[PDB]
Structure formats: C-alpha cells, structure tokens
Symmetry: D2
Subunit: 297 residues, 4 copies
Amino acid sequence: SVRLTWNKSPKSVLVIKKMRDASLLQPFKELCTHLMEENMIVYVEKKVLEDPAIASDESFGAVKKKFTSNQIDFIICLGGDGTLLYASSLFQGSVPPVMAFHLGSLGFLTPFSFENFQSQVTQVIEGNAAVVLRSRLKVRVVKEAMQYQVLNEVVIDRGPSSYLSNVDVYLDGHLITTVQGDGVIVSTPTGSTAYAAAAGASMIHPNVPAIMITPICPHSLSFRPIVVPAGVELKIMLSPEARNTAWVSFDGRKRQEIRHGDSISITTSTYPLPSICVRDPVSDWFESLAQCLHWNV
Amino acid sequence: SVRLTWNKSPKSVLVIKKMRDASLLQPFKELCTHLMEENMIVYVEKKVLEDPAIASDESFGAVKKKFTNQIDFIICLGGDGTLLYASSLFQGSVPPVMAFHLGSLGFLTPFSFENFQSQVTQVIEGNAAVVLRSRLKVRVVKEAMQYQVLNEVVIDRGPSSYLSNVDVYLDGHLITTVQGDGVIVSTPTGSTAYAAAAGASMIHPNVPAIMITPICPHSLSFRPIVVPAGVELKIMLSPEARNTAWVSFDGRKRQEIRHGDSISITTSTYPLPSICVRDPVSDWFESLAQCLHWN
Amino acid sequence: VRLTWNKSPKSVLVIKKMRDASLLQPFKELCTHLMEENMIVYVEKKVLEDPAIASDESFGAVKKKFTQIDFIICLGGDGTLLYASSLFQGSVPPVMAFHLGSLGFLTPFSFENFQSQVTQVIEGNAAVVLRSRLKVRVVKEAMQYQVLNEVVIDRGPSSYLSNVDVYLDGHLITTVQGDGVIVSTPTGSTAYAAAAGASMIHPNVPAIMITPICPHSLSFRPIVVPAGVELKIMLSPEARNTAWVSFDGRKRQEIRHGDSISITTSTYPLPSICVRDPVSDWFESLAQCLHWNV
Amino acid sequence: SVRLTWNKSPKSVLVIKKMRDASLLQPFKELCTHLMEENMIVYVEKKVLEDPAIASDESFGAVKKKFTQIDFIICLGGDGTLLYASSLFQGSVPPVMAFHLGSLGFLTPFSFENFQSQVTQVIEGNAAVVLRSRLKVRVVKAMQYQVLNEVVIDRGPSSLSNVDVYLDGHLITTVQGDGVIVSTPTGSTAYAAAAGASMIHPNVPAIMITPICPHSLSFRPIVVPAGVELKIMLSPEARNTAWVSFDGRKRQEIRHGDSISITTSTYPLPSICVRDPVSDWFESLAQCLHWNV
C-alpha cells in the first residue's frame, strides 16, 4: 500500500500518445492545455509535435511552441496497454510514476477514465494516489553487450521456420528443462495477463514477486507453466544438438536471431515501473480482468 | 473392421525412406533384397538411388539395377514424416501403406522391424487390419491449387509479427473470428500431431469428424471444437485487418494469403489406409502410451 | 431433416420444469392452444396437482381435458430434456424445447409467437438433430439405463483418490486416478464434461467421449472413441474404498469390487427440433450460453 | 541465504512414521536405535508403540522402553507424513526432514541410503531449508487451523455450488462448479495441480486460488499476494450446503451463516533440502508428476 513520494513538487510531464489514431487527437489537445495552464513544464515526444494532423490545425499552434531522459518527473499515457510498453522503453533507469488513460478499450495497465480528467490529474499532482511497483526483467544477449528492460514478456520462439525448437533453459546453472515446441514466454507478473496468458499461464497479481516460464504449444503434454522466485538468474541458450535457430522478441520489439553461441540471461530488474491506480491495487486488477479478458463471464 | 481386398496379387511396391539417416541404410538394403527375392516389381524414389552412400557401396549395385496409378502397395521407413511424404506424392486413391519404426515410434508406424520378413509375407499373402484415415481437400483461391492434407492445415502469423484476425466460415455462416497465433484445422489423425500441442483432444482415427483448434487464442473461453466430417469449411482474412496470414499444409510449401484469398476445407473421398499390427484400436492406445505418454 | 409424421399427430406430452412460478402462466397459454386443436394432450399426472395450479379456478376449465406419445413439448433449460429422455427408454418421439429466460444447448425455440412455431412443427416439416444416447448396463455380483448427456463415475460420500480401470473391447486402456471420469455423448460435451476440459463436439459426430475429472497425471487428456465401441468400467482390484456412479444427475449407486458398468451407444436416438438448422443453432448456443467467442 | 541456526544442540527428536506399511517397519527400527545411540532423547507418538507388529517383535523391545518441546522432526513416508507433522504443531514447527522409502514426493528430498551419514550432517552441520508457507484458517459459525497444502471448499455428499469469494472485503468472484481449492505454493503440486493450477516454487510468497471444474470456460486460476485476507462464504441464493476440507482432515459443513477466512500464517514449516532448494524442487517434478517427460 505504498502511497506516493514527490519530495519536490512536480514540474516536468512527459505526455505519450499511442499515435496513428484520430480518436486520440482531440483529447490530446484538451489535456495539454490544462497541463500547460498550470506552471508545469510539458515534455512531448519529438515526432509527435510534427505530425501532419497536429501541424495542420493552426488553432492548437498557440501552445505547440511551449513544448520541449533524466528530468521527467511524471508520465501521462494515452492508450491501452500499448503505450506503457513504449514508456518503459524510453526509461531504462528509474522510471517516474506513470498514469495511463483508456479511451475506449480498457486494458490491464490503464485504470483511469478520461471523464473528469481535470479533477483526477489535480489529485495526482497535489494529493497522494496509490501505486503498484510493477516488476521488470533485465535481459542480456551475449554474442560470440546489449541490455534490455522488459515489462510484459520476453519470447524465445521459432521465427520463419517449420521445425520444432530445441532450446535449453538454465536456472542458476542448474538446467531444468529443454522446451520443445514453438517457444517460451518468460514474463513478469504484469505480463501474466499478456500474451503469456494465451499460452495457458495462470494470472498473477502484480504484487507477487516472481518470474513465470510458460511454453508456446509444448510438445510434451505434461509441461506446465511454472513460476520461479523473483531473485533467480535465468539463462536460455540453444541446445547444441538442435537444427535451425530461434528468434527472441522483447515486448513485441526488435527481433534478433540467436544461434548455437548466443545466450540470453534474465534477472528481475532493480528499477520497477510505478503505475498509479484509480481505487487500489487489488480492486482495479480484478475489475480489469472481468472488463477486458472476461475472467468470470 | 475391413481386412483387405487385393483383387489381383500385388506386383508393385513403392518404398520411401525417411532419408538423411545413415542408420536407415542397412535395413533398407535388407528389405529391398528381400522384396527383390520375390517376383515383385520394386519402385523406389528416383532421387533416392543417387545418394553418395548408396553409390559408394558397390555391393548393393547388384540389386540397384532392378529398381524402377501404378503402385499397389506402399512400404514406409521413418517416423511420422514418411507417411506425410507418401500422402503428398499420392493425391488420388493411395494404396495401402505399411510403416516401420526404426527406433522412435510414432502414431502412424505400428510395425516393428524385428522379423520383418514374416510380417511382410503376412501382409502380402494374408489379410491384416487397416485404418481408413481421413484426409482434407483444401483449395486455395486467388483473386486453382488443391492439396490433400493428412495431419493438419495451419493458418498462422508467419514471417511477421502482431496478432491475427482471420474469419472462419462453416457452411456459409461465420461461426467465429479467431484472434491469436492461428488455427490448426486438422483430421483425426492429426489430433496427436501439432494440433495436440495447442490443447486439442485426442480423436481416434475411426471417428469421422473435422477438428478446429486455435494456437494461443486471445480469449480464455475459446475451446477446440470438432465438426461433422461432411462439412464445407472456408477460412479467409477479416476485412478489418492489415497484416496478412500464412498457410501451411503438413509442414510444406507456405504461401501468404491476403484480403482476396480464401481457403476451403472439405473431407476427402480418397482416404489413406494404414495397416495395423494388432487391431485398429489397441495400436492407437499403445502409440498414445509410449509415443506420447498418454498416462 | 425430412421429417415425416406418417399419421398426423394426435398425442402431445408436455413436460414442465416444475418448481417455478415463472413457468406457470406460459404453461396455461400453450395448453389452451394445444387443446384448441383436435389433439389429445398428455401431461404428467403429478403436474396437475400443485396448489398454484389448483388455486387458479380460471384454468380449471381445461384441466379436466388433460390425460402412445407422438410428439413432446418441453419447457425449461437443459433440465427438462434430460427428464424427457428418462420417461422414454425406447423410441422417443421428436422433442421441441422452449427456453423462457435462460437459453440452453437443448432449447432452440423462443417462446415469442409460439402459436406460429408450433403450427409449423405440427403441419410442416422441420429440421431435427438425432442426439446420441448410451445404453448403460450395471451388473452386480441387472439395471439398464439410457443416458443423454453423461454417466459419471466418481467418489461420493467419501474423500479419497480413485483407482478404477477402463476397459475398451477387453483391451483396458487406462486406470484413471483422480476424481473420476465423465464418459459422455456429444450432446454432453457442452455440460459437466466441458467443465473438465473436454473439447466441444457437434451433436452430428458419432463418437463417445472419455473425460477425466482432475486427473492426477498432468499428461492425461480427454479422448473420444468410435461410437460403436463397448466400454466397460470397473474398480481396480488393488484399490481401497469404492466409487459412485451417476446418470445425468439421477440415482447414485455405489459400485464395489464385483460391480461392472458397460457403456454402448444406443440404437434409440433423441430427435430434437432446431429452429433454423442443425449447425448454426449449435454455434449460436455456444456464444449465447457458454461464451465460446467472447 | 539462511541455512540453519540450532542455537542449542538438538536433544529431542520426534519420529513419525507413515504407518500402515510393512515395508516401513524394518527401517523404523534401524533409525531409532541409531538416534537413541547418541545422547539424544527420542519422542514417538504414543499410539505408534502399540501395534501388533511392534509388540510382537521382541528383538526391538530393548529400546522400546526408552521412547518418551520437540527440537527436530524426522518423517518417514511420501507427501502424506508432513501433513500429519503440521497438524501436531500449530505454533512454531521445528525443522522437518523427510525420507522417501520407495515413492518420491515433493516434501521428501532425502534418500534412505547411507542414512547415518546424512543424519550426522543435519545434527552437527548446517543444511539448507525451505521456509514453506502455511495458511491460518478460521471458520466462524472460532476453530482455527494451520494448513500446509490446501483448503478445499467443494460439494460433498450432495449433487453445482454457488459460493462467494471475498478479497479484503471486495467480492472478487463467485465460483460455480465443484468448488475452490485455495492452496499454498507447496500445495501447487498437490491436488491443486490436478485442477489446472500452475506449479509455484515454494520460495514465492503468494496464495493461489484455483477452481475445481468451473462452469465457465474462461476462469483461470489466480494467485494473489501472500499478505492478503481471504474470506469465502455461501451466496445468499442457491441454498445448498457446501463442505470444507483441510488437507483431507475433518470435513465440516458450511451453511448460510458460516464464513471461512484465510491468511498466510506467521509460523512457516522449515523442510530441510537435500542439496539446494531450487534444484531439489525441479528433481521432484521429473519423478513425481513427470514434468516434461
């Protein structure tokens, strides 16, 4: 039940929109006006302020000139479960608190509703609103060097190919299983409702410190989606007696092939992602399950 | 349980080897010598009799010369892939197929290689039980190309990313729109194939039905369904989708399907008969036990 | 599918779900219309004795005209058609099931404009689904049953694992260990069998399902076998305690070491009339009731 | 990485046997003689030393008199003995070492071969342990229970079940079906696994909620933070009694006014690992339930 900690009053706001959506153009204008109305410096993505849709409207040009890594104090995200992934990408270090709004479809990371947004934003800036310290994974891909921070899942699966994958999974140098099938969806508790859920994984509340291992259509019918303690060091590498190679993805981002020499190491990060909740960590998660994924209906 | 009907005594044998396996050389040589001992014409794949392993061994050159709608009986070597190749090579009325498992045992390879001469003589002379395995007549129409599929036809997100939105029409009615990795519409014989890894139930090959199984569906309440055999399926991309989908036929040629393309699936009239070592039922459960660890 | 009455229908057997006030008034409207035509109406003798139906003197006018079955009309959801099969161990006549409120897998017909729908079934030809049933025979150290949805062998007033052997043509296939088994017809694939992880089978597939209840082994999945097979389930000799058998949520009887149960597809199917077609009715039922898509 | 802290050298040992097995009769004699050989008091259940098998054998009568606050627990049997060990210790339970004579379970890491050398290491040296979580359960009609594997609320001698589940005062779900199998991470490999639950390592501090054959096709097992307050009670509608079981112990009947509350206990069960907590758990998966062939 961590409430909040500002230390110094907020002054920098990084507003990130899902883009490529006309429906989000108009609500973006209203929020920026109110945020700019208060004595708060507003950061917006560099590419966002130069789209033809935002450039054509000369009415909004009044505040466009007042826009502007390590000085962001608070993040506002527009969009459902596709924007918070991008927010974590720009912050490999300590990411500030993130408040996500759902305009239409409601996701697992977007509790706040857009109606009466002025009152909700003022409460976060002035008052205290409860947060969930969501866990993240740091993955290192060693080539025979390149870290990543992953919020939902890292997937090691067969890319363009036909043969079943044969990749070995190590847990603290104590090789546990060799998964044969499409792949594995090693994931955080936040990703338990993500693509990992489609593979038969159980749904973990984001306050449970753990790392999940879930196959994608395993060949063995007794292979279950285990979950391991948070502080363990994983290591996934191709088995030496295995034809064809495998591809790795990071929250639906850059895909790079791993061969008989490359190894990926997974460990829980020390820089969590705080997401603000509208009511409380427990009720919002269960409300999200029913409204989005139909947990009980 | 239909046994056998030769009409005329067998004279042509088509032997397919799994290939790319040195362990299959000597048993193949022994079987070919035994078959050539009898007055039976032996057909072997043309590109099989040109490998460096089969060319270097000059001892086998004594019988190498005697090789060669004209096949009466099929002998298969390999596990669960050789019968796929045989079905691919025979788009019409495929003759009876007998499969031998040399090491690993599959769902389509009941016969053991020990005392192979006696088993082959019994199959040729006597009557042995068969399973008339069903196949699918998939037709892909472009904005023209039929295939016969024994295990499964898969429509999934191929060399690309992002979710999939493809519509499934059954007898002209949109039954469902599957979102996820894809769908594994398959025969009962494929119920133990990759369709099984996606959560499908295990259907005995004497059940006349067609299965529909998703690959990691987005909705938690979307269970595999099985539909009557004599149904006409039709899978095509949803109009409100951007990324195209890729279709595979038993792990064979993959072709991307765009908005204007549709695939139609219907039970074939040319089944694949596979001879059983003991009976059509017990062999399936034995294969489930050892091959797949059913319990 | 090409329904022929041979002789025009004259006997109608109406079964109500009972213990439901909401079904009292709709029952009155249908019986008046059915009695309006020159058609003998059969109703269960215990139906016309409830205080609710006796108190209303207005309906007493046609109560006397109630009373070899040619056609069956059912009211209720997924619980009435099971009772309809119970009274007919032989050739059950076609059954038309109405849903008032909740919609089930056995009840396609909507109660609105029931007069037009009933007249079409009586006069015109409608489409039917020949639902498969199981001839279950229990032999002690003989009681024969007909089961439409499922026969379940599981622990009852006790709490321990189960070790029961499943024989298939004398070639015992597995010893299921866990809660039990839900051997069932395709019509029961949208029932308690489905709650155990069974795939949903269209009722035109002629096969028999075997679905465990919480099996102890992780790699043990529901199987479906050809319809014409003879199943035989009996307790394993090296197993303590006993198991209990249920027939569509009906009488339970304990089976001990010497008792065996034999299951075989019946030769007397249950014809259920569909509103549009055998296929699209089933898929609509999946979405509206079991949420197969959402 | 805490391993063990005896503080005071062990002097009291409670040896509990799975019983009802002739194969376990002989190994029981060997261990008790060796444990009594060292200057260490041995406790045995009072009903154990009265069976015809133990009374008839006059050879073992030499030390039968010397049997008699427990400092260390030795268990014989597979996955059925530590449940009995938890029952006798509702407070702080001492370290528990379990031997698998034949069948290999999840709470029984130690093998009986070269037992004497293994016993000396535990008494003298330090061995790694798993602080397994337990659930304190209150049934209010205030009879508490401590549960190691699972508490099950399911239909019993009857024929669906409509029972409500509350989490910190909020109705999270209403489960319809056979019932709910709320369990600890140690119970994830127990009958909770047969219900479709994922397999949780016993070092993950969480509480699992899993249905038993739920009516809805989409009702996935959920796992919640350890320090949360569960409260399960019958729905006001669908008046039919449900039954509650605690690791297969006394099955009670819950009516409309009965409530069951589940929270993580503050008295864990320390089970001694054989080589290390991580590798031992994966070894048990391969042999017991054949996880990935």
